[PDB]
Design a protein around this ligand. Structure first.
Ligand code: B12
Ligand code: B12
Ligand SMILES: C[C@H]1O[C@@H](n2cnc3c(N)ncnc32)[C@H](O)[C@@H]1O
Ligand SMILES: C[C@H]1O[C@@H](n2cnc3c(N)ncnc32)[C@H](O)[C@@H]1O
Ligand SMILES: [Ca+2]
Ligand SMILES: [Ca+2]
Ligand SMILES: [Cl-]
Ligand SMILES: [Cl-]
Ligand SMILES: [Cl-]
Ligand SMILES: [Cl-]
Ligand SMILES: [Cl-]
Ligand SMILES: [Cl-]
Ligand SMILES: [K+]
Ligand SMILES: [K+]
Ligand SMILES: [K+]
Ligand SMILES: [K+]
Lengths: 182, 551, 136, 551, 136, 178
């Protein structure tokens, strides 16, 4: 696979200290696809989400999830393992969620449901806010992005990308911790 | 060298839409797929042993649920034996009563009724829909949202939408923790605009049920079901969890319907090689099997999937027709953006608008689409005058009416003042007089002062955590000088005690009068029969702005 | 009851009582303000839901009537427990034993025989279709 | 203080349209008027003594013509006694054959058939129209014009429109003296794009017949009739002059239809207190009485009159339905601007597009509307891609097809070169190579070099004054390097010798195959019968530009 | 002729002759170029129009057939005379005597009996409805 | 009140153009459909004719409110065979004796689009036709929204114009105020 930058270094273990946020990426992230739905590189997305977490004085840990390609469930697997209970799930096509242990799987703290509108500045802010939740702040939510033509332009493409993402699901396979080549 | 003709056409908005060629292997085909199962049913010892070619040993949870609960076995041999073309003819024949058809359609397998409606063109489907619609009187539902989750604006927009004629109104959240404020604001504004308008707040399922239990909603609609097992699973439910949830709503006296819609299984990655319409038929039968009275369908939020492929908008009308033919209330979408083209979105709306359904739109945006938190509706607030004009052009009752600007200003202001009194009375973060005036005259959130969102969601979640219930809102209205609004809010809560509005297609009109398919049975029998636009309702629709006196 | 008995609030208001045996005309604004009635009083009864089930049957809607019969049983279950049971039926939440214990508890505490059978039916199929805890 | 909501709505294009309140006394009411006469007929010794309340002593020329020629008097009293609600039910019932209805409708009076269709909503009317349409296959007609009467552009635009699927095309003139050039250019371009497309040039009646006598047109359509006697008079005809004109065209082997349409009598100042629909029904019976095979109606050029009042667009569908129900070919308008709103004009088009008529539009503008010399059409060249998308969305055959830019360039170029050869051979003012290139790539006349209009119209009128006929064009083509086009032109002239395309709904498809209601009879009998979009024609419609292969 | 005999060009091309007894096959580019056929030859016959009228009756269209019968008579009338008669029938163009003269001409010169009666009928009605010369 | 009758209009002598106005022109209506004064309209048409050295003669017609028949009766009385017909709502036609009533030399069928510059140019062209010249036709004005904006208004103004039709009454020559 071209553009590789994520190495699985074993089964992710649950963090014991509040000092971290887990970025949980879907099974195709950085592999079958290397950009999101509007062509922003996964490398740049992950770089900005990590930078946002770390500039808030919180550790960033990246894992890949396999049991589902749904981004909520990817984030739930992450919030189970995160020492802060806070996780960020990112699909290959770019859809992102800030999640919290104890919330229902399809609930969340913040949701970014129109991937085509996300910029690198947004991804940095998503990481900042996730870290601020980990510090038990109540951060100003990332401002809502909403474009009534996003679905007309991109829903069919979103479905095709997700279909391809789902081929990487592995029943019963626990998350793998990633070494990030950044 | 370029043709300037083609350079002009290339710039047309429609050429920004997403189109795809059929992809049968992944279900990217609207209807009439080669992989769709042929109709069949085998019944042994009063139990289904084969459904549409599949033996019971291969049943997934959807098959089991449909086979055990979703098919009227009392007439199954008769209707399976009938020719599907003759059955399609019976649907659009004005002289075959709805009451004669429902025992047969409810006995069909999912593939059988798909086969029946797939013999039809959209004119025939519309001719059938005007008869199969459960409620005689068509109605309308609106979205009320904004990108800031601003509660003052929600209340004002809700009041205006109720005043324009919507009988149900729906909100949802940019930030999930805001939900109690959105819900309360919608309910207060709706009762100000027209007492009896039903309100819902679309959330994750357990969250929405809890919010309903506290009394801040009147019904729930986005109770989602899906047409393949892996997709249902990523939807975080099974047919049994959703059936239990349906009965949980009713056990609290709350009206509810399910939601489905063609294309969800493609969007969520597992169509099992089946057409969108066949998978959607499975969803309709899940709804029937659960004992749920009604259904929002017509692709709904996944409209970009069927619309991308041939006959997708026809399939959307077909799935609405299957819903009504199964004797379910049909809240028939027209609530979600799929096109940059005004021509194209109008064609898609008229399939339901012309015959009428229980809710012609299940989410006309009562705000400008930039504020629509379902990512945009097929119609929005800037379309209100076009919608009224088309009602008058065609003599069609689309559920809305022309309204006076001075009336809308007054009703929006009253709603904003009532919510101000609720927030003061409940010790919520204040609504200022400046916010009240802004919401009174706003078009959308671009016109509203910024609120302290961090403080709002703190108090919003305290409503959940301290179980602050709807009678607190009633009390705050009463103590703040809004005795009338408090009485109307109390009357909405009393409707949850009688069970009357739990029945098929129920709304609350006039002076607290339930109007449902039970006491407003559709009795269509051809021209000059059934529901007709006439009388004072017709005078209301004719009275559009700008109609000049000629002499 | 038949469709001619519908709506109950117009044809037979006295057929409707609440979980605390209050009537519809008890819920006045002044009774709410004085706490003479409270939210605990404002809850639909199994009796009302079984009447509405009978009306649904008479309207030709047997599956709707079945839903109302399940709902009549669930009126007895507290709000928090309803949420617990709903969540337990979602995918991968429960073991087979946890679901069967929910069913037996539904009967012993609330006599919710139809709902208990519904939960046991799900539990059996969740084994075959691999929707129990640890099946993901 | 303004509501910003109403400020947004006030800017909407629909609020620039003309709306008026009903004005009974001057006929500014679309249908269902209290002044309209009640249906009646009395017959004594085989002649009508009373028609719709009016005694024979008060008959105007329209009453006389209809009463003597337009009603089957042997069954008129029987059909008058029939219940108009049941007759309307028969119209939309898929199981009452078209051939069972025509003997009833041809025995009704104008007010009787109006009373019948006025019981119907637009869904019921569309359901009836798909059955009553005479020709089983729907078709389409285009306008080809420009504001300069530029013949090179007309020829290229006509070739493109023929290539996109129009089976009839129509021109007219900004400067009346230009007409022979417009007609010849239209004919040559149409045959280049698809041999067999029929062409007309809409003029004053005597002028248009003389032009058809010289062989420069294939048919005539704008042979106008009117629903009151003073309006007919200002139209410079009577029923007897127009009936004679109809047989004159046929006596030269030329296909023709009449044109009428709701609101002409209001526009021309004498509605005699009657609704538009009743007066239009008189026009339709004038057409039937004259023995004319078809009618262009649906308000047509007066669409701003019914569209201004309530139920006007429904009335427009009703008058199309009356036309087809009387076993006339219906060219159903959708050819004239009435609104600034894309939503509104789409709703108006769908009334005929969805069921299908003999010509869904009788003048889709094949040029951008700034060039449309009928003052703008309800659809124009910039809508081509939307129209194709809606055919694909709904699986509806609207008569057109997606096309490739390189094919259109090639066909427009050949058309311009062919006309250049005609002009050279006939000694007409030259068509330069620069003009040929411009016409190839043009979107409209903005892209065309200026011609010497004074010189052009001198030579165009010489075509009339010297009786230069169609065989000069054939010879110029054959001697100028276009023997292929020359043969196609000769084949079009040879159709005037057989009488085949004089019959109801006739067009010429494929390899000179006449396709009319005689050999393509509509046999609609409900779902899965009658015309269905399928096969290669469906593949054509599916293949729109932009559809990505999702593999 | 029946519906099955239609269209003539596709089923029975040899049924079609022209006013000068030419056939369809005579109309080729070569014969046009050589002037072996001219515009004078290219005109439909009364016989063809009466065959099409028979088809129209078999298709249930009696009034269309009547139109074709009037057209069949009018084939004998020259183009300029057709235009004169059409003009004469327009409002306020003609005296009653002029219309009756046109009718006698149609009958006695061209044997256009049906068209002659049509024009006589117009004359009578133009008196009553005041559409003759001088009535405006 | 700028138009006065000076008696029944007579046959024209050859160097003239007749401007034939409808029966409500300058009376019950005094502006066209977009509010241009009838006095200004006639001023410009007359000035355009006279600029070409041709005499302008104005008549009112009564037998029909239709602008073609208004102009037709003007061209039969015109010493040049050339007439200009103008309705109250502004519709204008240049007509020529010998043409069918519903034919013309030039037609201006969207009254909302005419300006006083167009009206002057129409007079100029008519005078050139009277001199047997072949002027460039006045360039075509076409607005696809003209009917959506104005057709109902055009119908209503014509209904009102039509009330002044008088059967059997010959045209009257008009004096135009200075
Ligand atoms: C399409 C859509 C759906 C679709 C597709 C979901 C999917 N997984 O494919 C359907 C109808 C099935 C759906 C279901 C739900 N949705 Co939804 N959905 C939308 C909608 C209307 C448009 C999104 C879109 O098309 N974007 C454009 C495309 C090109 O960008 P995209 O990044 O590829 O979009 C993806 C995400 O939006 C994702 N997604 C959609 N909904 C949800 C919900 C959650 C919690 C998550 C994590 C992701 C997610 O699905 C899209 C396709 O992959 C948004 C409205 C909005 N404001 O965006 C709501 C919205 C995002 N959904 C919402 C909700 C509440 C839900 C449900 C939880 C409701 C329920 N009854 O269970 C479920 C979650 C199911 C799931 N597993 O994701 C809320 C979220 C509120 C919040 N602040 O948390 C929104 C804002 C509004 C609403 N009520 O519908 N949804
Ligand atoms: C509406 C219309 C009609 C209407 C109404 C006519 C009326 N007298 O009320 C109907 C359908 C009845 C009609 C009939 C005819 N029309 Co017409 N008509 C139009 C159209 C499509 C739009 C004009 C419009 O709405 N303007 C907007 C309004 C607000 O402005 P207005 O000034 O008030 O409009 C008036 C004039 O347009 C006038 N008018 C309309 N047609 C004609 C024709 C002539 C010769 C005259 C003098 C005036 C005239 O009627 C309108 C309302 O009063 C134009 C196309 C165009 N390019 O403009 C053709 C057009 C003007 N008509 C034309 C023709 C040929 C005719 C007929 C002669 C056809 C026939 N079969 O006899 C008749 C004339 C009947 C008559 N007594 O005027 C041609 C003119 C060609 C030319 N250069 O001379 C045009 C350009 C195109 C066409 N083929 O339809 N017409
Ligand atoms: C808008 C809400 O409605 C529901 N919803 C919308 N569209 C569909 C569909 N095609 N299938 C299932 N549920 C849907 C979801 O619950 C979503 O959140
Ligand atoms: C465009 C051409 O079509 C004819 N035409 C258009 N609309 C109508 C109508 N409502 N009535 C009669 N004739 C009409 C006229 O002849 C016009 O010139
Ligand atoms: Ca909705
Ligand atoms: Ca036309
Ligand atoms: Cl395809
Ligand atoms: Cl079909
Ligand atoms: Cl049932
Ligand atoms: Cl009105
Ligand atoms: Cl109706
Ligand atoms: Cl007939
Ligand atoms: K929900
Ligand atoms: K579905
Ligand atoms: K004509
Ligand atoms: K008419």
């Amino acid at each position: 696979g071209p553009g590789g930058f994520l190495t699985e270094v074993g089964e992710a273990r649950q963090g014991t200290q509040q000092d971290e946020v887990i970025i949980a990426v879907g099974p195709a992230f950085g592999l079958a696809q290397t950009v999101n739905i509007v062509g922003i590189p996964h490398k740049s997305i992950l770089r900005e989400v990590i930078a946002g977490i770390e500039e808030e004085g919180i550790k960033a840990r990246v894992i890949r999830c396999f049991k589902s390609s749904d981004v909520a469930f990817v984030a739930v697997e992450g919030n189970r393992l995160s020492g802060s209970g806070i996780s960020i799930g990112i699909q290959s096509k770019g859809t992102t969620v800030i999640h919290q242990q104890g919330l229902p799987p399809l609930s969340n703290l913040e949701l970014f449901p129109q991937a085509p509108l996300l910029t690198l500045e947004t991804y940095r802010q998503i990481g900042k806010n996730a870290a601020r939740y980990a510090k038990r702040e109540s951060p100003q939510p990332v401002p809502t992005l909403n474009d009534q033509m996003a679905r007309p332009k991109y829903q069919a493409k979103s479905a095709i990308l997700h279909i391809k993402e789902t081929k990487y699901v592995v029943t019963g396979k626990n998350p793998q911790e990633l070494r990030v080549a950044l | 060298m370029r043709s300037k003709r083609f350079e002009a056409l290339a710039k047309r908005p429609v050429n920004q839409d997403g189109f795809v060629k059929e992809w049968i292997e992944e279900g990217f085909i609207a209807m009439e797929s080669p992989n769709d199962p042929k109709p069949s049913i085998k019944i042994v010892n009063g139990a289904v042993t084969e459904l549409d070619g599949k033996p019971v040993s291969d049943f997934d949870l959807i098959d089991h649920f449909i086979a055990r609960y979703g098919i009227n076995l009392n007439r199954a041999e008769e209707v399976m034996a009938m020719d599907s073309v003759k059955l399609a003819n019976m649907l659009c024949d004005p002289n075959v009563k709805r009451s004669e058809i429902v025992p047969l359609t409810t006995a069909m397998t999912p593939a059988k009724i798909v086969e029946v409606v797939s013999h039809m063109n959209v004119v025939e489907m519309m001719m059938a829909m005007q008869k199969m619609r459960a409620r005689r009187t068509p109605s309308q539902q609106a979205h009320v949202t904004n990108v800031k989750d601003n509660p003052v604006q929600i209340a004002a927009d809700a009041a205006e939408g109720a005043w324009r004629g919507f009988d149900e109104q729906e909100t949802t959240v940019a930030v999930a923790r805001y939900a109690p404020f959105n819900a309360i604001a919608l309910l207060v504004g709706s009762q100000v605009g027209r007492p009896g308008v039903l309100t819902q707040c679309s959330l994750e399922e357990a969250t929405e049920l809890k919010l309903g239990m506290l009394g801040h909603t009147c019904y729930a609609e986005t109770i989602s079901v899906y047409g393949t097992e892996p997709v249902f699973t990523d939807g975080d439910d099974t047919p049994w969890s959703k059936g239990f949830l349906a009965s949980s709503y009713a056990s609290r006296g709350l009206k509810m319907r399910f939601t489905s819609g063609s294309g969800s299984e493609v969007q969520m990655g597992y169509a099992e090689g089946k057409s969108m319409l066949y998978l959607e038929a499975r969803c309709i039968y899940i709804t029937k099997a659960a004992g749920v009275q009604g259904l929002q369908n017509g692709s709904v939020s996944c409209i970009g999937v069927p619309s991308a492929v041939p006959s997708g908008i026809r399939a959307v009308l077909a799935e609405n027709l299957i819903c009504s033919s199964l004797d379910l209330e049909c809240a028939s979408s027209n609530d979600q953006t799929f096109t940059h083209s005004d021509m194209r979105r109008t064609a898609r709306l008229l399939m339901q608008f012309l015959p009428g359904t229980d809710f012609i739109s299940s989410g006309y945006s009562a705000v400008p689409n930039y504020d629509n938190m379902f990512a945009g509706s097929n119609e929005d607030a800037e379309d209100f005058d076009d919608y009224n004009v088309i009602q008058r052009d065609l003599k069609v009752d689309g559920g809305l009416r022309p309204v006076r600007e001075e009336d809308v200003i007054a009703i929006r202001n009253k709603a904003a003042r009532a919510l101000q009194a609720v927030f003061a009375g409940m010790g919520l973060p204040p609504i200022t007089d400046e916010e009240v005036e802004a919401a009174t005259y706003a078009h959308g959130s671009k016109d509203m002062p910024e609120r302290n969102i961090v403080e709002d969601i703190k108090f919003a979640q305290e409503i959940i955590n301290k179980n602050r219930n709807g009678l607190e809102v009633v009390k705050a209205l009463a103590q703040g000088g809004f005795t009338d609004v408090a009485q109307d809010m109390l009357n909405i809560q009393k409707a949850k005690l009688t069970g009357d509005y739990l029945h098929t297609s129920a709304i609350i009109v006039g002076d607290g009068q339930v109007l449902s398919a039970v006491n407003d049975v559709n009795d269509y029998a051809g021209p000059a029969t059934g529901y007709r636009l006439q009388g004072e309702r017709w005078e209301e629709i004719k009275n559009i702005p700008g109609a000049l006196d000629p002499n | 009851a038949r469709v001619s008995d519908y709506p109950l609030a117009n044809k037979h208001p006295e057929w409707v009582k609440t979980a605390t045996n209050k009537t519809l005309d008890d819920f006045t604004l002044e009774n709410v303000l004085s706490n003479k009635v409270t939210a605990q009083d404002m809850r639909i009864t199994p009796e009302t839901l079984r009447l509405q089930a009978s009306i649904a049957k008479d309207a030709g809607r047997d599956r709707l009537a079945m839903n109302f019969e399940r709902a009549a049983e669930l009126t007895a279950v507290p709000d928090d427990r309803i949420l617990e049971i709903y969540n337990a039926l979602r995918p991968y939440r429960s073991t087979k034993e946890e679901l069967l214990a929910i069913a037996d508890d539904l009967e012993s505490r609330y006599q919710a025989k139809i709902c208990a059978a519904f939960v046991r039916e799900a539990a059996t199929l969740y084994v075959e279709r691999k929707k129990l805890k640890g099946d993901d």
